[PDB]
Every structure is written in structure tokens, then in C-alpha cells.
């Protein structure tokens with residue numbers, strides 16, 4: 223009745239996003255039929271990858287393929303216990319969050335060099351996050367990895383709010399880029415807060431069911447809604463984008 | 466005499482392509498001595514990577530490093546048995562099939578955005594294929610992963626047959642691009658057919674020796690012959706390509 | 709007193725570079741405050757990633773997350789024994805050595821195609837190196853992987869010394885590119901020599917403490933000093949670089 227409850231929280235939190243990612247793919251495909259080949263069609267292709275990765279990720283977690291048990295180190299609020307870890311999330315972020323950055327980058331028309339470095343910083347953020355969840359030898363190391371990951375995040379954040387906005391202004395998309403940048407910054411901040419507050423971190427919240435739902439809700443906005451806003455603006459502003 | 470036979474099928478299927486990939490590298494290097502630095506030399510560099518990855522892949526499988534046993538889930542034609550899985554193949558495809566796409570892309574002179582998205586879809590195809598072979602918890606999940614992988618493949622296929630052909634026409638290479646696109650589409654289709662028909666899939670064919678040979682033969686055409694045709698046309702048409 | 713000594717060699721060899729990478733990040737950040745946004749700021753962003761990856765790598769090894777024991781195959785100087793392997797190094801190289809190549813590439817203003825192929829060859833070099841250290845089934849295979857890895861290295865080396873220098877000449881940076889290319893070639897050569905001479909290879913040197921220190925010292929020059937020279941020249945030559 224707490225295990226019954228913890229398991230109902232887990233499975234529902236995964237099944238919903240398998241549904242919602244699936245539906246988003248369908249809708250994004252239907253939307254792409256009335257978009258002119260070119261720079262709009264490039265932004266659309268990049269955008270469609272986002273839920274395709276997300277549904278893969280969630281099939282990963284549902285099947286157990288990318289879920290494991292981790293013994294928490296001495297000093298942890300749950301020291302000496304095996305904790306459920308959805309390390310599949312941290313893994314697939316490393317492919318899905320660069321799809322987001324590619325869409326934005328194409329939208330804001332950035333320098334490929336800036337693009338390559340941001341995406342590199344982003345893959346570093348994701349991988350050191352996974353290192354943090356997997357590290358079992360000491361509490362010191364888990365949070366050192368957390369902090370390195372934050373440093374990467376900052377690199378990604380800086381480029382958005384400076385260079386990429388600058389590129390957006392002279393590409394004619396500064397306004398829509400600024401709507402999306404805000405969503406992205408606000409919502410991406412949710413993830414390290416969830417990690418820290420949740421069971422892998424401080425464990426102020428000890429239900430993995432709850433933390434899993436927290437990530438799932440964040441995915442809904444950061445991926446599917448983000449992607450839907452992008453596509454609606456692009457289909458309405460095709461000339462403002464092409465060439 | 467069936468184990469003697471299954472093992473002779475396996476080892477020969479791997480050793481041949483170690484030989485053939487090795488020879489292709491030698492020949493491609495010799496061919497590259499009479500190619501002018503520039504766009505031809507870029508296509509050649511990209512093309513040479515193809516067998517270099519392939520020989521690595523096959524050394525992986527021969528040494529056992531990238532081969533494992535997988536228990537098939539309930540409902541599978543071979544439910545409850547350990548099946549030999551050459552998961553090394555699925556792994557290295559994720560680096561070799563983007564080398565192919567890079568060669569084609571350079572040949573057809575595509576938009577880097579289209580390039581980045583195709584390659585991303587391609588890496589998604591390969592990784593979800595591996596997810597499908599590794600999934601053991603249920604039959605449903607194995608084929609859901611198969612289907613997601615097909616969705617990625619379709620993304621890759623669409624870009625070739627539309628955008629990338631369009632780019633080929635105005636880059637002066639539409640004719641050679643169209644020869645290569647056809648080879649690629651026809652032969653890449655062979656891979657999910659082999660998976661489905663073979664032991665990891667439906668198991669209409671239960672010899673892993675046979676399925677391994679089927680992949681090996683597909684590699685011969687999709688990589689080595691593909692790469693040989695590309696290089697012969699490029700060395701004969703260097704002006705039609707440069708700048 | 710030999711175990712006491714072997715362990716003091718190991719931990720000091722890792723802790724030093726956690727320190728030094730940490731300090732380099734601080735200094736590189738401080739240096740980047742007086743660099744004009746643009747092509748200089750792109751080179752700086754790429755350069756800063758280098759120690760960020762390196763410190764991650766070393767936190768990986770210190771925590772045990774990326775260290776393992778490997779049984780050496782028959783015919784090895786240490787056949788039948790478990791050897792300490794810092795496979796974390798081989799792993800993270802695959803992300804850090806492309807940051808180096810990106811910096812150089814941005815500095816020399818190369819063709820993205822050459823860039824993509826070099827980086828691909830570089831990731832191949834790193835991954836087949838890891839294959840070599842992990843292979844346990846036979847000595848033949850370990851060195852075949854060593855040799856494939858060398859072939860990749862050669863691809864990377866050729867592009868530097870020909871194409872990328874050519875690009876450097878007409879981008880106005882040939883002189884600084886040539887200083888950096890020399891450092892890179894000389895120092896990157898150190899790594900397969902250390903592997904071969906050390907315990908994973910021939911085992912002319914059987915202390916993993918010693919080989920670990922050898923890699924650590926190579927990182928100091930190939931990453932931190934390399935990166936420091938790059939940044940000092942860029943801050944002094946911003947007009948020679950921009951646009």
C-alpha cells in the first residue's frame with residue numbers, strides 16, 4: 223500500500239510519457255506536411271527527433287533495460303540502502319538535449335562553432351550527471367560530479383543568453399528565440415533541483431515515484447510543449463525564416 | 466556436426482570481412498594518392514573511415530569483446546533459451562553508418578543542418594536497434610524498439626530521396642548520387658529484414674551462423690563496394706566536384 | 709612498502725591533475741573576460757571545455773567508477789594476472805581530444821568536412837584503444853586493436869600537417885598553428901609509447917603507478933599548457949583572428 227503506491231507512481235509516470243511522446247510525433251508529422259522545404263523544413267526535422275528520442279528513453283525505463291539499483295555511500299541520508307535509479311534518463315538526455323539545441327540553433331542561425339561547443343558542453347553536462355548517480359565509493363565524489371555538471375550547464379546557459387540571442391536578432395527571430403530561451407532556461411533549471419532534492423541527492427524527497435513524476439512533468443514542457451510552440455511559430459512565419 | 470557447423474559458419478563469416486575490410490583500406494589508400502587535395506580529398510578521407518570502422522567492428526566480434534548471450538522472453542519462438550547476439554554490429558553501425566552519410570552528404574553538397582539531423586536520426590536508429598536486441602523483460606518491448614528504430618530509418622530515407630537529391634542536382638552530382646542512393650536504400654533495407662527473419666526477431670531462421678553471414682554479405686556491398694564505386698567516380702570526375 | 713608505494717603513486721598521480729585542471733579552468737575563465745565576442749570567443753569556449761572534461765575524467769578514476777581489473781591473456785608478460793586498468797582515461801579522451809581538435813580547427817579555419825572526418829578518426833582512435841585494453845581473449849587481438857588505433861591516429865596526424873596547415877596559412881594563423889601542431893604531434897605520440905611500454909602492452913614497465921604518472925604528465929602539456937599557450941596568443945592577436 224506504500225509499495226503498491228510507489229509502483230503505481232512509477233509505472234504511470236513512464237506510461238503517460240510513452241503516450242504523450244507518441245502523440246506528439248503523430249501531430250508533428252501532420253504539421254510538417256504544410257511546411258516549405260528549406261530552412262523551415264530543417265527546423266522541423268530537428269524538432270521531430272525530440273519526441274522520437276523521448277519515447278525511446280521511456281521504453282528503455284519501462285522494460286528495465288535502463289533502470290538499476292545503487293547502494294548509497296556513507297553519509298547519505300539513505301546510506302547502506304539500494305536506491306532505484308532511472309539512469310536511462312541521464313543517458314538519453316545526451317542525445318535529446320542536443321536535438322533541442324540544434325532546433326534553437328537553426329532557429330537563431332548561430333555560428334557552427336558556437337553550436338559545436340554548446341552541444342559539447344551539453345553532452346558533458348549529461349554524462350557527468352550520470353557519473354554522479356552511478357558513483358558509489360563516496361558522497362564527496364557524487365557531488366563533485368554534480369558540481370562539474372553544473373559548470374557545463376552554465377556554459378550552455380551563457381551561450382544562449384548572449385551569443386545565440388545576438389545571432390537571433392540579426393536572423394530576424396529574436397522574439398520567438400526569446401520566448402523559447404526563457405522556457406528552456408526556466409525548465410532546464412528544474413532538473414538539477416529535482417536531482418538535488420530527490421533521493422539520489424539530498425533525499426528531502428524519498429519517493430522515487432515522486433522524483434520520476436517530477437522528471438516526467440518537466441519533459442512534457444521542455445520537450446513536447448517546447449516543440450509544439452516552435453512548430454506553430456515556424457509554420458506561421460516561413461518567410462521570416464527561409465534563406 | 467551441427468555445432469561444428471554452426472561454429473564454422475560463425476568464424477568464417479567474421480574472418481572474411483576482417484580480410485576484405487583490410488584489403489579495401491589498402492586499395493582505398495593507394496587510390497587516394499592520385500586525388501587532388503580539396504573537396505575530392507575530403508570525400509576520400511570520409512570514405513576511408515568506412516572500412517577502418519568495419520575492421521574494428523569485426524575484431525570486436527572475433528575476440529568475444531562485443532558478443533553476448535541473451536535469454537529470449539516468453540512468447541518468443543525460442544523463449545527461455547540463451548541466444549548468441551552479435552551486439553557489436555549494432556554498436557559499431559552507430560559510427561560507420563554516419564561515415565557513409567558524411568561521404569554522400571559531401572558528395573551531394575547538402576545543408577549542414579540536414580546533415581546533422583540525418584546523422585542524428587541515424588544514430589537513433591542504431592541505438593534503438595541495440596536496445597531491441599538487449600531487451601529481455603518482454604517481447605512487446607523488443608518489437609516496440611524495432612518499430613522506433615524503423616521510424617528513425619524512415620527519417621534517414623526521406624532526407625536522401627528528397628533534400629539530398631535536390632542538393633545533388635545543383636551540385637552537379639545528381640547522377641552519381643542517384644546510383645549510390647539506390648544501392649544504399651536497397652541494401653540498408655536488408656538489415657531490418659535480416660533482424661526480423663533471424664533469431665533475435667521472429668526466428669524463421671534459427672542459425673546465428675546464417676544471420677551472421679547475411680549481415681557480413683550486406684556489409685560487403687553497403688560498405689566496401691559502395692565505397693569503391695564512390696572513389697572510382699570521384700577520381701574520374703574531380704573537376705565536377707571541386708569548389 | 710611496494711603496495712604502500714604503488715598506491716601513493718596512483719593517488720598522487722590523479723589528485724595532482726584534479727588540482728591542476730581545476731586551477732586551469734579558473735585561470736581560463738579569468739582570461740576570457742578580456743576577449744571580444746566572436747571568433748576569439750569561439751576559440752576560448754572550445755578551449756575551456758578541455759580542462760572541464762579532464763577534471764571529470766580524473767574524478768572518474770579517483771572514485772573507482774572508471775577503473776577495473778583485467779586478466780592478461782596467455783603470452784603476455786603478466787599472463788594470468790589481474791592488472792589495474794585506468795580505462796576511464798581511454799574513455800574520456802574520446803570527448804576531450806575532439807575539444808582540442810575543435811580549438812585548432814577554429815584557429816586554423818578549416819573546412820567543416822575535414823573537421824568532421826578528423827574528429828571521426830579521432831573518436832575511432834580512442835575507442836579502439838579502449839577495445840585493446842579491455843580485450844582478454846587473446847594477445848593477438850589486443851595488438852590488432854592497437855594497430856587499428858594507430859591507423860586512426862595517422863589519419864588525424866596527416867590532416868593536421870597538410871590540410872589544416874594549408875587552412876592556417878590563408879587564415880593568417882599559420883605561425884601559431886605551427887607551434888601548436890608541433891606540441892600536439894610530439895605529445896600525442898607519447899600516449900601510444902606509454903601504452904606499449906607499460907603494463908597493458910609489453911610491460912617493460914610493470915608499475916601501473918608509473919604509467920599513470922606518465923599519462924598525467926602528458927595531460928599537463930597536451931591539455932593545460934597547450935590551452936594556456938592558445939589563449940595567450942589569441943588575446944594578443946584578436947584582430948588577426950576575427951571574421
Ligand SMILES: *C/C=C(C)/C=C/C=C(C)/C=C/C1=C(C)CCCC1(C)C
Pocket residue numbers: 312315318319347348350351352354367368369371372375410411413414417441444445
Ligand atoms: C528533455 C530533457 C531535458 C531538458 C533535461 C535536461 C537536464 C538537465 C539540464 C540536467 C542537469 C543536471 C545538472 C545541471 C547537475 C547534475 C544533475 C543533472 C544531470 C540533473
Ligand SMILES: *C/C=C(C)/C=C/C=C(C)/C=C/C1=C(C)CCCC1(C)C
Pocket residue numbers: 555558561562590591593594595597610611612614615618653654656657660684687688
Ligand atoms: C555498414 C552497416 C550498415 C549499412 C547497417 C545498416 C543498419 C540498419 C539500416 C539497421 C536497421 C534496423 C532497423 C531499421 C530496425 C531495427 C533493427 C535494425 C537496427 C537492424
Ligand SMILES: *C/C=C(C)/C=C/C=C(C)/C=C/C1=C(C)CCCC1(C)C
Pocket residue numbers: 798801804805833834836837838840853854855857858861896897899900903927930931
Ligand atoms: C588529453 C589526452 C590526449 C591528448 C590523449 C591522446 C591519446 C592518444 C593519442 C592515444 C593513442 C593510442 C594509440 C595511437 C594506439 C593505441 C593506444 C592509444 C589509445 C594509447
Ligand SMILES: CCCCCCCCO[C@@H]1O[C@H](CO)[C@@H](O)[C@H](O)[C@H]1O
Pocket residue numbers: 297298299300361365418423424425
Ligand atoms: C545542492 C547542494 C548540495 C551540496 C552539498 C551536499 C551536502 C552533502 O551531502 C548531503 O548531506 C546531507 C546532510 O548530511 C544528506 O542528507 C544528503 O543525503 C547528502 O547527499
Ligand SMILES: CCCCCCCCO[C@@H]1O[C@H](CO)[C@@H](O)[C@H](O)[C@H]1O
Pocket residue numbers: 540541542543604608661666667668
Ligand atoms: C516484422 C514485424 C513483426 C512484428 C510483430 C512480431 C510478432 C510478435 O513477436 C513474434 O511472435 C512470433 C509468433 O508468436 C514468434 O515466432 C516470434 O519469435 C516473436 O518475436
Ligand SMILES: CCCCCCCCO[C@@H]1O[C@H](CO)[C@@H](O)[C@H](O)[C@H]1O
Pocket residue numbers: 783784785786847851904909910911
Ligand atoms: C609496440 C609494437 C609491439 C607489437 C608486437 C607485440 C609483441 C607481442 O606481444 C608481446 O610479446 C612480448 C614478448 O613475448 C610480451 O612481453 C608482451 O607482454 C606482449 O604483449
Ligand SMILES: [Br-]
Pocket residue numbers: 232283289308
Ligand atoms: Br522505474
Ligand SMILES: [Br-]
Pocket residue numbers: 275276279314315318
Ligand atoms: Br530523452
Ligand SMILES: [Br-]
Pocket residue numbers: 475526532551
Ligand atoms: Br560470434
Ligand SMILES: [Br-]
Pocket residue numbers: 518519522557558561
Ligand atoms: Br561497422
Ligand SMILES: [Br-]
Pocket residue numbers: 718769775794
Ligand atoms: Br587508479
Ligand SMILES: [Br-]
Pocket residue numbers: 761762765800801804
Ligand atoms: Br580527458
